[PDB]
Scaffold this motif. Sequence first.
Motif, PDB file in Angstrom:
ATOM      1  N   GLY A  16       0.491  -1.359  -0.336  1.00  0.00           N
ATOM      2  CA  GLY A  16       0.059  -0.037   0.134  1.00  0.00           C
ATOM      3  C   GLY A  16       0.965   1.194  -0.058  1.00  0.00           C
ATOM      4  O   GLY A  16       1.071   2.030  -0.676  1.00  0.00           O
ATOM      5  N   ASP A  17       1.867   1.664   1.250  1.00  0.00           N
ATOM      6  CA  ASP A  17       2.621   2.518   1.649  1.00  0.00           C
ATOM      7  C   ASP A  17       3.310   2.681   0.922  1.00  0.00           C
ATOM      8  O   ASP A  17       5.053   3.523   1.723  1.00  0.00           O
ATOM      9  CB  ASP A  17       1.976   2.901   2.914  1.00  0.00           C
ATOM     10  CG  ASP A  17       0.753   4.041   2.610  1.00  0.00           C
ATOM     11  OD1 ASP A  17      -0.262   4.485   1.483  1.00  0.00           O
ATOM     12  OD2 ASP A  17       0.041   4.714   3.937  1.00  0.00           O
ATOM     13  N   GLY A  18       4.287   1.900   0.137  1.00  0.00           N
ATOM     14  CA  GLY A  18       5.716   1.729   0.293  1.00  0.00           C
ATOM     15  C   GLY A  18       6.558   0.452  -1.054  1.00  0.00           C
ATOM     16  O   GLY A  18       5.559   1.189  -2.601  1.00  0.00           O
ATOM     17  N   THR A  37       6.747   3.729   3.518  1.00  0.00           N
ATOM     18  CA  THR A  37       6.286   5.619   4.359  1.00  0.00           C
ATOM     19  C   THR A  37       5.249   5.394   4.982  1.00  0.00           C
ATOM     20  O   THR A  37       3.857   5.105   4.308  1.00  0.00           O
ATOM     21  CB  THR A  37       6.362   6.299   3.082  1.00  0.00           C
ATOM     22  OG1 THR A  37       5.465   5.795   2.319  1.00  0.00           O
ATOM     23  CG2 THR A  37       7.422   6.256   2.196  1.00  0.00           C
ATOM     24  N   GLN A  38       5.192   6.143   6.137  1.00  0.00           N
ATOM     25  CA  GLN A  38       3.674   7.322   6.849  1.00  0.00           C
ATOM     26  C   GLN A  38       4.040   8.791   7.397  1.00  0.00           C
ATOM     27  O   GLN A  38       5.350   8.541   7.143  1.00  0.00           O
ATOM     28  CB  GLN A  38       3.667   5.869   7.325  1.00  0.00           C
ATOM     29  CG  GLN A  38       1.976   6.550   8.129  1.00  0.00           C
ATOM     30  CD  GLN A  38       1.253   5.475   7.135  1.00  0.00           C
ATOM     31  OE1 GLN A  38      -0.081   5.933   7.693  1.00  0.00           O
ATOM     32  NE2 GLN A  38       1.298   5.155   5.816  1.00  0.00           N
ATOM     33  N   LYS A  39       3.456   9.338   7.063  1.00  0.00           N
ATOM     34  CA  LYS A  39       3.258  10.987   8.058  1.00  0.00           C
ATOM     35  C   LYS A  39       3.369  10.988   8.946  1.00  0.00           C
ATOM     36  O   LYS A  39       4.482  10.990   9.148  1.00  0.00           O
ATOM     37  CB  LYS A  39       2.029  11.104   6.923  1.00  0.00           C
ATOM     38  CG  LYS A  39       2.050  13.316   7.457  1.00  0.00           C
ATOM     39  CD  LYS A  39       1.158  13.645   7.418  1.00  0.00           C
ATOM     40  CE  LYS A  39       0.871  15.316   7.808  1.00  0.00           C
ATOM     41  NZ  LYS A  39       2.421  15.882   6.513  1.00  0.00           N
ATOM     42  N   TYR A 110      -5.030  -2.064   4.796  1.00  0.00           N
ATOM     43  CA  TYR A 110      -6.525  -0.485   5.265  1.00  0.00           C
ATOM     44  C   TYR A 110      -5.822   0.859   6.323  1.00  0.00           C
ATOM     45  O   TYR A 110      -6.245   1.944   5.803  1.00  0.00           O
ATOM     46  CB  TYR A 110      -7.598  -1.567   6.132  1.00  0.00           C
ATOM     47  CG  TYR A 110      -9.345  -0.378   5.428  1.00  0.00           C
ATOM     48  CD1 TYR A 110      -8.988   0.873   6.838  1.00  0.00           C
ATOM     49  CD2 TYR A 110      -9.566  -0.973   4.800  1.00  0.00           C
ATOM     50  CE1 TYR A 110     -10.267   1.011   6.680  1.00  0.00           C
ATOM     51  CE2 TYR A 110     -10.982   0.158   5.109  1.00  0.00           C
ATOM     52  CZ  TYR A 110     -11.278   0.850   5.807  1.00  0.00           C
ATOM     53  OH  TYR A 110     -12.295   1.903   5.570  1.00  0.00           O
ATOM     54  N   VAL A 111      -4.660   0.036   7.009  1.00  0.00           N
ATOM     55  CA  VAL A 111      -4.228   1.492   7.800  1.00  0.00           C
ATOM     56  C   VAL A 111      -3.558   1.921   6.210  1.00  0.00           C
ATOM     57  O   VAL A 111      -3.634   3.346   7.106  1.00  0.00           O
ATOM     58  CB  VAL A 111      -2.876  -0.173   8.684  1.00  0.00           C
ATOM     59  CG1 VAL A 111      -2.733   1.474   8.810  1.00  0.00           C
ATOM     60  CG2 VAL A 111      -3.629  -0.253   9.440  1.00  0.00           C
ATOM     61  N   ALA A 112      -2.797   0.944   5.437  1.00  0.00           N
ATOM     62  CA  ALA A 112      -2.411   1.947   4.488  1.00  0.00           C
ATOM     63  C   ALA A 112      -3.304   2.428   3.266  1.00  0.00           C
ATOM     64  O   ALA A 112      -3.340   4.407   3.075  1.00  0.00           O
ATOM     65  CB  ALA A 112      -1.270   1.360   3.832  1.00  0.00           C
ATOM     66  N   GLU A 113      -4.771   2.239   2.772  1.00  0.00           N
ATOM     67  CA  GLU A 113      -4.605   2.660   1.810  1.00  0.00           C
ATOM     68  C   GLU A 113      -6.404   2.409   2.014  1.00  0.00           C
ATOM     69  O   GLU A 113      -6.586   3.446   1.276  1.00  0.00           O
ATOM     70  CB  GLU A 113      -4.749   1.394   0.302  1.00  0.00           C
ATOM     71  CG  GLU A 113      -3.344   1.102   0.144  1.00  0.00           C
ATOM     72  CD  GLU A 113      -2.950   2.539  -0.456  1.00  0.00           C
ATOM     73  OE1 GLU A 113      -2.923   3.371   0.176  1.00  0.00           O
ATOM     74  OE2 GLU A 113      -1.867   2.013  -1.614  1.00  0.00           O
ATOM     75  N   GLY A 114      -7.095   2.968   3.951  1.00  0.00           N
ATOM     76  CA  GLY A 114      -8.286   2.351   3.542  1.00  0.00           C
ATOM     77  C   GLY A 114      -9.292   3.993   4.257  1.00  0.00           C
ATOM     78  O   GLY A 114      -8.216   5.283   4.245  1.00  0.00           O
ATOM     79  N   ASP A 115     -10.333   3.478   4.232  1.00  0.00           N
ATOM     80  CA  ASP A 115     -10.835   4.736   4.679  1.00  0.00           C
ATOM     81  C   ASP A 115     -10.676   5.100   5.976  1.00  0.00           C
ATOM     82  O   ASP A 115     -11.788   4.262   6.740  1.00  0.00           O
ATOM     83  CB  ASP A 115     -12.146   4.750   3.700  1.00  0.00           C
ATOM     84  CG  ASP A 115     -13.513   6.368   4.439  1.00  0.00           C
ATOM     85  OD1 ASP A 115     -12.902   7.448   5.193  1.00  0.00           O
ATOM     86  OD2 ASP A 115     -14.402   6.621   3.143  1.00  0.00           O
ATOM     87  N   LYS A 116      -9.948   6.214   6.333  1.00  0.00           N
ATOM     88  CA  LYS A 116      -9.494   6.270   7.854  1.00  0.00           C
ATOM     89  C   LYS A 116     -10.418   7.087   8.604  1.00  0.00           C
ATOM     90  O   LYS A 116     -11.420   6.962  10.199  1.00  0.00           O
ATOM     91  CB  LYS A 116      -8.257   6.767   8.114  1.00  0.00           C
ATOM     92  CG  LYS A 116      -7.579   5.817   7.304  1.00  0.00           C
ATOM     93  CD  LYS A 116      -6.180   6.104   7.815  1.00  0.00           C
ATOM     94  CE  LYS A 116      -5.398   5.662   6.365  1.00  0.00           C
ATOM     95  NZ  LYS A 116      -5.171   5.376   5.416  1.00  0.00           N
ATOM     96  N   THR A 117     -11.888   8.040   7.876  1.00  0.00           N
ATOM     97  CA  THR A 117     -13.150   8.034   8.678  1.00  0.00           C
ATOM     98  C   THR A 117     -13.880   6.878   9.548  1.00  0.00           C
ATOM     99  O   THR A 117     -14.592   7.087  10.381  1.00  0.00           O
ATOM    100  CB  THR A 117     -14.221   9.189   7.337  1.00  0.00           C
ATOM    101  OG1 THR A 117     -14.341   8.221   6.721  1.00  0.00           O
ATOM    102  CG2 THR A 117     -12.496  10.259   7.296  1.00  0.00           C
TER     103      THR A 117
HETATM  104 MN   LIG Z   1      -1.750   5.799   3.624  1.00  0.00          MN
END
Ligand SMILES: [Mn+2]
Length: 175
Positions: A16-18, A37-39, A110-117
């Motif tokens: 997802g994020d890498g 990667t992550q903010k 999901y943590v990477a690419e999911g709707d986090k709301t």
């Molecule tokens: Mn992400």
Amino acid sequence: ENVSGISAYLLGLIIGDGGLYKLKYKGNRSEYRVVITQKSENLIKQHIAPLMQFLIDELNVKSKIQIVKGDTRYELRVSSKKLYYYFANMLERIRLFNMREQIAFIKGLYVAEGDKTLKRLRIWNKNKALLEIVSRWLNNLGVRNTIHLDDHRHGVYVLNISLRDRIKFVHTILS
DNA sequence: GCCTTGCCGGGTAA
DNA sequence: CGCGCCGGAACTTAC
DNA sequence: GTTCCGGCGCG
DNA sequence: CCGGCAAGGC
Ligand SMILES: [Mn+2]
Ligand SMILES: [Mn+2]
Ligand SMILES: [Mn+2]
Ligand SMILES: [Mn+2]
């Protein structure tokens, strides 16, 4: 067994994020990178890093967990041919994941690419095939879902999890 | 009248 | 000679 | 998210 | 990824 669960989760963060990078430099030097990667400084140092460290120890990878601060993001990076092939070989076998691994991977993705709301339950990716595989996993876990092309600007697909199974989704996969 | 889910544009976090 | 671990970070876009 | 750069180190 | 909007089913 328990390394496989943590492995599937990290692989979810990675896809997802890498990335998994095989680089050839000038010359003829090489490098093999396992990247997440992550903010959030916190998520990467207090959650992801210790999990990568357990895995590293457990595989006797003697590389170091590097954390490079960029302007838009933190990058966790393990420079290791072994760990590279570990995740890449596992990615090759994604269709053979057992339930523990399916659940861990989906959580990672999901943590990477999911709707986090969590208002809606959505996952984004250009990789339709990957979403198809996740979709079957969700169906055999009792989570209804559909996949369609969401962003025509960038060919990004979305997997929408039906709000009707919100609870079954939230407690089975995310918890 | 309300709920779910496809549509689509902005720009930040990949 | 060819190759594999560090440490950044400029660069583009897929979430 | 991806791939450049210059570094050091191995047999 | 986020988040307003509306088509459509109940
Ligand atoms: Mn992400
Ligand atoms: Mn991604
Ligand atoms: Mn992402
Ligand atoms: Mn050991």
